[PDB]
């Protein structure tokens, strides 16, 4: 009944603005604009945002505010047959924790690494470098940059691992950074939301300040406007290519994060009559806007690299960790006051992921507290038991070969697993429960029903938008590979028996409860499709 509520309304919004904005807004969206014809890419990205992303973002936020419970209890109360959807989502988020925080450490390692007059990653005459060290990025594989060799040879020591079977030594300089991450996560989430919803004031906001002072520093560099050209010069040739709508579709889904039980969790502590539809629209737009901004911060410095440093644009217009740990640092090492751009750049990368780890873990804590009161009372104890396990098994990721184990989790822990789980979320809510019954819920909350646009996006466009991604995610499938390393067969099977370790609980729990209640066969479905609110 009388469960907690955000001490302030901004605490909620920043917790959502923060969960949604992470490194993928920096090291993935600007690249897609660059690859897919500049401004023209905003067409499919907006269309996929407006019909796939915002519909699913609004939906889970509503369910969270309305049913007032974490992800397990809530799906168990909409369609009890499909209660397993909640169980699956908590697992998928549990898995992602085993590799997502390790990239926050990388950001702190380079932070504790930028306390120097001469940043270490700029020169090719260190002990870790090779005879094939260029000062900047190239397009020949055997000859890496002074910052690709700093990252892959001093920070990581990935060179001393023959593959996933060879983990080798624990880098305790990194294992210390991982503990600093889970310490920050513990003392932000342990005493509940009253404290959490305050830390997001720094972690959700600090990036906007660094983005601003790096935007000025980026746009005032010789050649910055040439980067913006590479970033946004429209080329509508690509809008006619199918493999572009999939990049839009896939960026839209994995950047807003609907269906992972976090907006559900966060909204469950809203007041019942909060204008969550306005909270969806506001929060969403702020995500996509934060990527558009970041893309100037990148391609300004990318053009300056291409004009005053002699590097092909193709060779620095990268995505993923390489762009923020190798390319962009190596551009900072040239500009004056480099030490300052580093320290704020890495402190930005760190605070960008902490927001998101909070919500991923808060979805877990909430979902179980609302179902296992044995742990709802015992909270401070519980999270210590979660993070310690995360840390302990996370020592595996602080090895010389750790990265191989991470790329693996990166592909299977929340891959097609979350796509198919969210597919049964759209179907459960729109079809089994009922769009009409859902709108009547929404009316009672904010006072009006969802427009027909929203209701058509919920029973038709959403499951097809998802299906659209999931099918093409299987069309262009390949076996798992990093550089010349090809992961063994048993690594992939290990990965599948991780993606399935969550989806299977959808039909398993649907099979368990179906065989746990008395009655006739149809008589069972009807009892396992009647919501908890209708039975009283």
């Amino acid at each position, epitope marked *: 009944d009388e469960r907690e509520t955000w001490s302030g309304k901004v605490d909620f919004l920043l917790s959502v603005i923060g969960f949604a904005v992470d490194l993928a807004n920096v090291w993935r969206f600007p690249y897609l604009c660059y690859k897919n014809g500049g401004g023209a890419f905003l067409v499919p990205y907006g269309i996929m945002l407006a019909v796939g992303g915002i519909p699913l973002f609004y939906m889970e936020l509503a369910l969270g505010q309305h049913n007032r419970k974490g992800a397990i209890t809530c799906w168990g109360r909409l369609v009890p047959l499909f209660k397993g959807i909640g169980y699956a989502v908590v697992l998928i988020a549990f898995y992602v924790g085993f590799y997502y925080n390790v990239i926050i450490a990388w950001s702190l390692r380079f932070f504790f690494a930028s306390f120097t007059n001469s940043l270490p990653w700029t020169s090719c005459n260190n002990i870790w470098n090779t005879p094939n060290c260029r000062p900047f990025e190239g397009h020949v594989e055997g000859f890496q940059s002074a910052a690709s060799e700093y990252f892959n040879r001093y920070i990581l020591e990935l060179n001393r691992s023959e593959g996933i079977h060879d983990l080798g030594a624990i880098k305790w300089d990194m294992a210390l950074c991982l503990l600093i991450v889970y310490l920050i996560c513990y003392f932000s989430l342990w005493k509940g939301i009253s404290t959490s919803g305050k830390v997001v004031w720094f972690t959700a906001l600090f990036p906007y300040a660094v983005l601003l002072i790096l935007l000025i520093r980026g746009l005032t560099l010789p050649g910055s406007f040439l980067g913006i050209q590479y970033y946004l010069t429209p080329n509508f040739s690509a809008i006619y290519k199918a493999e572009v709508w999939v990049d839009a579709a896939t960026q839209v889904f994995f950047s807003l994060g609907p269906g992972f039980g976090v907006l559900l969790a966060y909204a469950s502590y809203n007041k019942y009559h909060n204008n969550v539809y306005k909270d969806a629209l506001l929060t969403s737009f702020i995500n996509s806007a934060t990527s558009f901004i970041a893309g100037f911060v990148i391609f300004s410095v990318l053009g300056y690299m291409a004009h005053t440093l002699g590097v092909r644009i193709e060779d620095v217009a990268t995505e993923g960790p390489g762009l923020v740990f190798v390319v962009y640092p190596a551009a900072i090492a040239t500009m004056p006051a480099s030490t300052f751009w580093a320290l704020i750049f890495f402190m930005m990368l760190a605070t960008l992921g902490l927001d998101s780890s909070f919500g991923g873990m808060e979805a877990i804590i909430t979902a179980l507290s609302d179902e296992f009161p044995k742990i709802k009372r015992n909270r401070e104890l519980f999270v210590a038991g979660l993070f310690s396990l995360y840390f302990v098994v996370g020592l595996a990721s602080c090895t010389q070969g750790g990265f191989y184990f991470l790329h693996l989790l990166d592909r299977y822990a929340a891959g097609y697993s979350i796509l198919v789980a969210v597919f049964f979320e759209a179907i459960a809510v729109s079809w089994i429960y009922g769009t*009409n*019954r859902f*709108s*009547e819920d929404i*009316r*009672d909350m904010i*006072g*009006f*029903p969802p427009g027909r646009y929203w209701q058509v996006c919920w029973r038709f466009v959403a499951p097809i938008f998802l299906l659209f991604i999931t099918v093409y995610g299987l069309i262009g499938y390949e076996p798992l590979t990093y550089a010349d390393y090809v992961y063994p067969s048993w690594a992939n099977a290990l990965g599948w028996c991780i993606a399935g370790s969550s989806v299977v609980m959808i039909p398993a729990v649907a099979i368990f409860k179906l065989l746990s209640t008395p009655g006739s066969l149809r008589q069972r479905f009807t009892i396992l499709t009647t919501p908890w*609110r*209708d039975q009283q």
Partner: antibody
Amino acid sequence: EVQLVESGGGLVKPGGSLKLSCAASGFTFSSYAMSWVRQSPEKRLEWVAEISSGGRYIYYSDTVTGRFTISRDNARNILHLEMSSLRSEDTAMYYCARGEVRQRGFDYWGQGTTLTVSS
Amino acid sequence: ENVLTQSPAIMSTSPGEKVTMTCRASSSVGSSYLHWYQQKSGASPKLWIYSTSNLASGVPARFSGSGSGTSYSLTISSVEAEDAATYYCQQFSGYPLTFGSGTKLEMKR
């Protein structure tokens, strides 16, 4: 084209019980929540009970709660109001109003049916 | 119960003149939740103004709404004889739902 016509109702003795009816036509009744508003002979409007578009959310007034019951029939487009334990204070014309959007008020009102509660 | 009080209770007015009438809540009301109904003698009420200032369908442009918080006002730029009615404000923001006490508009002669 949308039209509400209320029905039933007349003279009851105190403690009696009556059931009023509102016949919706000209729109998709099931998509809109409805509410009973009454008007005393002193010409004072008073809200009585709201019923959500699917009847799962139902708000009464403190002056009729425990005595009055509101219900829907989206199959035949009828809105009912079962009154028990009637009192002379319940004497009014009873109106049937259509209000699905709280930010828009009651967009369509019926025509009234009269209840006298006298011995 | 959010008691709404309308003032004046009765005002007479010559056609062409400008008339203002006030609605006063005992508890603040969000401006998107305060509406106005007209009721003519022997007939049912009609929705006239919703969300403080938005005119309902068929309402001539000589009517306006203003106000916010606990004080709101209906205003008729130049009155006509077909406006002689009783005006009720309504609050839709909390339960129980409450109607004002009425303003009666009569024609001066």
